[PDB]
């Protein structure tokens, strides 16, 4: 029940004199305004304008723009005098069991409209959190009400959705947004907001964001407020992400020094900078395919850090796992350096 | 009726916490404005992060309002993120009137202290981020993690992050002297030094072991034996005997030594820890060092998977045996 | 507001680590440039059968083989020959008693075989003879009591008897508890008032609508009396109250145990409780006679089902029914119903089998039960497809689908039948040439040892479809294992994953298939050389035979490689021994069994050997001499030997 | 629950044979007059592993979205990782060539496919790949081992890299 | 009423060996606000007798009365389970491991009801009810997390002694808040002393040679020593210094199995040894116990270079065995790999 109170209060909510949520500044409005995934949006426009909209499954990593897209589609299909009469919005906030599917959903999909005649629509945000029996009733309520009401399923993990439910709808994946298309957006935000930023700043902003403009705006917002300047160092310090120079020195210590010296240096740096061994493993793996090695070095090293990433999951001692991480390089690469 | 010493002896106020200077300065400035940000305390455990946040909440609010306006939870729940999210929603939704007789009214936002902030997945942490943005104005949080690196980026962009470096051994030796003199227990300074060196810079575990030792002894002298076996710390001549058996050339005395270790009740994990600590700072070859340490790592995995202590120790000693006897 | 979340780290000057520069060593400055150039997929088209079995040729006429089978009714001679074949298969079965009853029962249908061959008489039940005699004697005593009370009524106008008014029937599912109750009540003229969990059974309602059944006479003592009204709320006939699944209790079933306590407390008519769980005996308080139905013998119910199919003009081998029953864990109603389905479908496979110990035999209901006929061709046999070499892509997908079907039940089909499937001889338990013998043995040994390495990898480092030890620990445990199914209507609301089940089943199927193909091919390649060894005069085939049990040899295929009768008897022995009052407070269970149990077996065998020497009788007075109330059956069982 | 089985006859259905699926799809495109290529047929069936409800669904999606049936259209609407790419992955594994296989795996990663469908597609592509049976057995057990890593929670590029490395070292190590 | 329970010490001062930490436990119960205890040591070293002695010291002798109560609990997955627990008016006894993956469930509600019992039952003796969790090493990770949540919710309501053999599977947060009590195995002379004590308490006198031989054969397992001594008593009314001390029958069946291992290396021998291990597992012997016994048997004939190799393959295969569910596959994998190695070794 409710929780639409907080969203409706939140939409025109800002201090507007001191708060500056620039993530909330730049919102696309319609499919012609969402400048990404243009094939998907044009396909939606084609299916809408032919009265041939199939059941939809919009899935992808969060923040890629599924909810605003389907909100634009809903406002396009139906005017503001009949939007609540034809579109039902739900999510996992109102989880009481499977009674949602046989309650509001089954009652809503079983009736005609109220004022004007036309096909209806239900959007189910975060439908991955629906239980297996809830989804298993949801497939039936789709099957026996397919001609009256179309269904939109907003999801984040494709695999968990039961096969028949993905079978009765077509699917659209909101993939990561390509960096070549995301650099002009951040350049526009920077020039509009008079921000000093270098090329490593753009590179770190797009690399950390992993094709999400919301998360990029969050990072640049935080760095601009915390420092007033944005670069690789300022972003990574504000993020608390591994600095590339630091992990480069970590790699240098395993590839040049001996066991004990590199061991205590990396231990002191982890204490000094607050790093957990998972992220060192990720960033050194990012360095492995870039630094030139023979193939045998690459397979042996990759297998060993894979097994270390396994062993770190169960929750063993991180100290001995760091030691084995140094040992992986000490076995092969430093022996060849001696050679 | 009585309380453990760790909360009994934690500082009441910020400025009473020692060894941290920029942390005290920024927390004091945020307390002066009566608008504490969302905090993110990272550092080794026992460094005083919970003590600092309790002191800050005690300074900002009233002591009778302190426990009312804080809710202490942990985040590695075996029932999922939905349960703790529902508790957070229940605590934020439930509002109780609060005032201070000291002349200053309390801020409207409450405090939820959620520890182990480095232990969740990215999905649960993003759910906590949505919960964060749900209650941005009416509750400000303090996430305590061992490592700031595991924090996903939307949280780290809106939280004031604070490093808590471990304290130099002299100052918590002085603090443990203060605890000993205020808790009327006879301890030699060598005992306090041994308790520090087996505490490995963990003041909270140090004072926990101290209270436990003084209630074991019942007022007697806290010897080095009782603090040797209250932390599970293996005697070092046992480690030396293990290395001597590995150097010796006989597997019979190897399994005899392992039997001596296991029927003594000494756990395999602590043995692996001290064997590793010896091996990392030795004159052994880096080839041998690497082979032994990767064997140690996989043995740690095996024992964490439920394998026998005895088998893993025999195989570990066999590998160290072969590595030592190859050069001989 | 948007305050600045400043990074507060304690940067002291020095420590040679706070401000770092990229290393000047040449290896780490040699960053290879990254290339995203993928091969273009618009140029390359996917061929037919590239990722699957899309062959240009298609089979026509092999499938869609309609049966249209018309079973001619068997004459007297061929039927009697089949009766004598059954008798020679099962010499311990009284065949001549049960077949006229089946002929009378059989003499356009609209009703199931379970109620067609429903036993009218308690003597017609199969198995659990002691239990049905005890129940029949109890009901004879109760009808004699009712008749004596009637004689007292016409004449007017209990520590010796120990006629307890209530009996608890317990046993496995479908063993015939309800059937035996119906049969004995019908024979002795009882009128059953049935109380089920399917109907509303709340305490006030059941008391207000069933108390006068046992507190009064019956208004219709003559005429239509042997009918069974299911109780619900939306010669003279004596009443008989029956309670089916007392273990199933709902929140709607409020105060039911207290209600039935009041019933047994105030009854004057016989009350029978039946259930399947063993735990109901301990949680329920009261005075009641207990009757246990064990699992019936496999060969007896096999002969009974074979008489049933013989009456319906079908001849079938015993071993197929043994496989079907062991697949159903000797469940009579399951095997009867699936036999009814498989018979009225027209039979599985028409293969003639001349046996004296005539119509064609109809072996093959076992693989039809597991759905293997939906995978293979009707000409293909299971073990025949298993024995030959697998090279065709379609044949290998059928073998994948076969293993996928058996791994949904978490059953290792290839390993539980490893002796019957490996290219080596199998038999039931009752020099440079020598270097070549030992070498061939060593290659076969290396192949099988690699195979056990693989299947150990499939146990540990492959997940299972169903998570094992979910409610108990691993099998062969005396702690519990009485995990009764749920009793509440609230849904689970769990967060399990299903993708890692459907994918994992195929994962273990493919791994098991490739490992077994590899090891079988290696054993065949090693055994190809055995002809030269036989020509050399030495035969190491005694080292290559597999000694299997007679019980495992009686089935076409096994779903398990172990003995469960032995497991059940040991587990009952240990549970009964550590139920003793003196040992009832032992905490460490593994220490309990592993320490006390062998020593107690030593004491039992020592007492037995002392009694074997014609010594003093007081050697029998050890366990009772230290108040060990261990029953003599368990003492004798533990004093036999350690197998 | 067990007595519900015990009071019934239970029958089993299997994933459908590809020849049967091919017959039903040519039947429905005959009854619908659908322009097509064979490329679309193997694509549309590969997207429907024995479950032709997927086959008709994605057939309708292809015909409504593009109007012609070929492999590229199917993989634009179903959005799977491409079969030829993962066939190239395991072919590079046969050659033990780590560089290209990792390069295009990173390409699939920044394309945005999840860990689970990549490892599933890797399974169903090295299943029917034309190569040696013993190395096929090793490959299957290795990809299952890495799939257990994703299934237990840890699902990163490092996991797929170690996957690929052990796959590649299986060729060089006898 | 054997020798281990009839002659069990009842108070702390009646303990015969390891007097010092018994006195420290007396100091702990004298302080009156002891936190949770974890106790550990090898089997037969005297953990449970120390636990019940500090229990009897803690409350009155109402600890000494014991009954059995049965608990039926619905799962979160809605499948109820029934377990048997030992109970007293002052303490409770739970071994949760019988629930398997549902150990976590067995963690909360009984203790919660014990909390409710502490909210219900008032005797004005002490402000908590103690419960002994047995075999906590077999608790799963989520079960230990649920235990941590239970203890950081009900620290002022109930207490818990943690009987285990190894704290390896104990996660470090559980080790952080519970006081460690290492209970080492008794020495040979201590076993002989308490053995002569229990024989004089039985009115029997034996030579010290039998006591020392029995102490060495028991391998510092005092419970096994007392049981075996009782077996020697049943064998012979008088005690003679050369009385044949009996051998454990599954141990010697395992020894004959190992004889079949080292004797002949044939696939028929593998299958018959597999049947022997089937007989052992139907006798409900734990798989790690079977493994430890068989490896200790077979290592006596192994040469120096073979012993180490057998060690790491045994540890690796038992790592998979605890990783695995059905121990049969792992045991057969070990035995077949040892066949391969051993056959490869006598041939060269
Ligand atoms: N392609 C895009 N271009 C511009 N803004 C975008 C784009 N995608 C997302 N956004 C922003 O994201 C906001 C809401 O997007 P959402 O639909 O909520 O993202 P999502 O993909 O549905 O995943 P969630 O909602 O975070 S779980 C919009 O108001 C935009 O500011
Ligand atoms: N021993 C048997 N002899 C003859 N027919 C039997 C036997 N056991 C079962 N049947 C048949 O199987 C049918 C079902 O038996 P039931 O008595 O209903 O099973 P049950 O013993 O009550 O176990 P439940 O109720 O499923 S827990 C009977 O009606 C008979 O037709
Ligand atoms: N700098 C300090 N000044 C004063 N007391 C400290 C300091 N650091 C640690 N302590 C003591 O150690 C204990 C640490 O407890 P806690 O705040 O939980 O540490 P953490 O949060 O780092 O785990 C506190 O109770 C406090 O008494
Ligand atoms: N001081 C003692 N006097 C007599 N018997 C003892 C003594 N200490 C230990 N024991 C015996 O040793 C056995 C050890 O069993 P238990 O108490 O369960 O400890 P553990 O858990 O280590 O096996 C007990 O049966 C007990 O009878
Ligand atoms: Mg969204
Ligand atoms: Mg019945």
Residue numbers in the entry:
A (entry chain C): 1 to 339
B (entry chain D): 36 to 363
C (entry chain A): 866 to 972, 1049 to 1098, 1119 to 1195, 1296 to 1418, 1451 to 1523, 1632 to 1844
D (entry chain B): 178 to 351
E (entry chain E): 2 to 349
Quote the paper.
Humans have three different proliferating cell nuclear antigen (PCNA) clamp-loading complexes: RFC and CTF18-RFC load PCNA onto DNA, but ATAD5-RFC can only unload PCNA from DNA. The eukaryotic DNA clamp is PCNA, a trimeric ring structure that encircles and slides along double-stranded DNA to promote processive DNA synthesis. We show here that ATAD5 has two unique locking loops that appear to tie the complex into a rigid structure, and together with a domain that plugs the DNA-binding chamber, prevent conformation changes required for DNA binding, likely explaining why ATAD5-RFC is exclusively a PCNA unloader. We obtained four cryo-EM structures of the ATAD5-RFC–PCNA complex (intermediates states 1–3 and 3′), in which PCNA is in different configurations that affect the ring opening and closing process during PCNA unloading or during dissociation of ATAD5-RFC from PCNA after unloading.
From the disordered-PCNA intermediate state 3 dataset, we derived another intermediate structure (open-PCNA intermediate state 3′) at an average resolution of 4.2 Å that contains a 5-Å gap between PCNA-2 and PCNA-3. This gap is unique because, to date, all structures of clamp loaders with open PCNA have a gap between PCNA-1 and PCNA-3. Unexpectedly, the RFC4 (subunit D) in the disordered-PCNA and open-PCNA intermediate states 3 and 3′ is occupied by ADP. By contrast, the ADP in RFC4 of states 3 and 3′ is stabilized by Val41, Thr85 and Arg239. Superimposition of PCNA-1 in the cracked-PCNA and open-PCNA states shows that PCNA-3 moves by 30 Å. In the open-PCNA intermediate state 3′, there is a 5-Å gap between PCNA-2 and PCNA-3 (the PCNA-3/2 gap). PCNA homotrimer exhibits a spiral shape in both the cracked-PCNA and open-PCNA states 2 and 3′, but only in the open-PCNA intermediate 3′ is PCNA-3 free to move further down to enlarge the gap. PCNA-3 is made highly mobile by ATAD5-RFC in the intermediate with two ADP molecules, and a PCNA-3/2 gap can form. Therefore, the PCNA-2/3 gap could possibly be used for PCNA unloading.
